[PDB]
Design a protein around this ligand. Structure first.
Ligand SMILES: Cc1ccc2c(=O)c3cccc(CC(=O)O)c3oc2c1C
Ligand SMILES: Cc1ccc2c(=O)c3cccc(CC(=O)O)c3oc2c1C
Lengths: 182, 182
């Protein structure tokens, strides 16, 4: 399955690298800033899983209640196959009623970009329907992997959603917040 | 298929982001004052593809006739879902008769690590036999993509190999050199 490999490669090639040091980098960030006397970031890495596989260039631009705040301190890698890559994660501000309301490390799952690309290239032989099925399957497979992984306990949260074509103008921020509030 | 998703993901998530500025970076390295006239590096990316999916943390060690020379200058990333990542690529010298006989940018394909891991975790439901067939399928799929991809013409080389049953006398060095001298 396309989704199966993606769920595994996302875990092996990213999450494992990132997760172990994440709580620490966040502790660093909360104590070391100011900037600023007003904080403060949640402990998990919130992963966005749009089922439509729509990933924006800019997460901030896309939503008006999600505003880029800052970056976490950088991380360096020396697990196998990666040496001297430099990584960063981004912190976002969430507003509710022009207020408050959350500060968290937030990012789109990169393999959705791949699922989208595949759907648009004739060479992939991958239909838009295939994409939706694999996107759901990707989410389920990843949930399962993470549930059992030593690296991934209490420091990661999956936010899966579809924005309904029918009626409503969906709130990404309400979605993130609902997950956030625990 | 697992391979299909891995190959497409490797193209979308690494190659088409790294290849466009590769030749520019190589020449810049080739130009540099410090870079003694000895050893003009070749202009393509040499991607190692062990079919047994064995990937060492240290390539230079796998073959004594293959030694790490230097690092290319770092590349910073703009692209979406990745802001401010920093990539680096490594330069290696190859030897014939104990003396340098080639210089090239050389690395193992990361998704083979994932295929190896999947074979090692019960949850992946992935056998060793599965792994080999998926590794061959990965190489084939990647070839087809790069065969007609705009990002990837004349700047990339795939070296796929199996180390024989009769001997470990198999030399990667010669395999790489073989491709290297043409
Ligand atoms: C831009 C981009 C697009 C897709 C992937 C990806 O599918 C993918 C799948 C598994 C692991 C990685 C590596 C990572 O997310 O750092 C991946 O990275 C991607 C990147 C960086
Ligand atoms: C350490 C490691 C292991 C596996 C992958 C991977 O499967 C994988 C698959 C597709 C894309 C990427 C990203 C990349 O290789 O830069 C991938 O990165 C991985 C990395 C960095």
């Amino acid at each position: 399955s396309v989704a199966h490999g993606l769920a595994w490669s996302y875990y092996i090639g990213y999450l494992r690298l990132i997760l172990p040091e994440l709580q620490a980098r966040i502790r660093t960030y909360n104590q070391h800033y100011n900037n600023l006397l007003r904080g403060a970031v949640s402990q998990r890495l919130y992963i966005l899983l749009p089922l439509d596989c729509g990933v924006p260039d800019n997460l901030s631009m896309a939503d008006p209640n999600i505003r880029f705040l800052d970056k976490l301190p950088q991380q360096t890698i020396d697990r196998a196959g990666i040496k001297d890559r430099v990584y960063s994660n981004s912190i976002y501000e969430l507003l509710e009623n022009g207020q408050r309301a959350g500060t968290c490390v937030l990012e789109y799952a990169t393999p959705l970009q791949t699922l989208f690309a595949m759907s648009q290239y004739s060479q992939a032989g991958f239909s838009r329907e295939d994409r939706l099925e694999q996107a759901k399957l990707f989410c389920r497979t990843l949930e399962d992997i993470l549930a059992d992984a030593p690296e991934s306990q209490n420091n990661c949260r999956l936010i899966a959603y579809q924005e309904p074509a029918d009626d409503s103008s969906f709130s990404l921020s309400q979605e993130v917040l609902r997950h956030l509030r625990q």
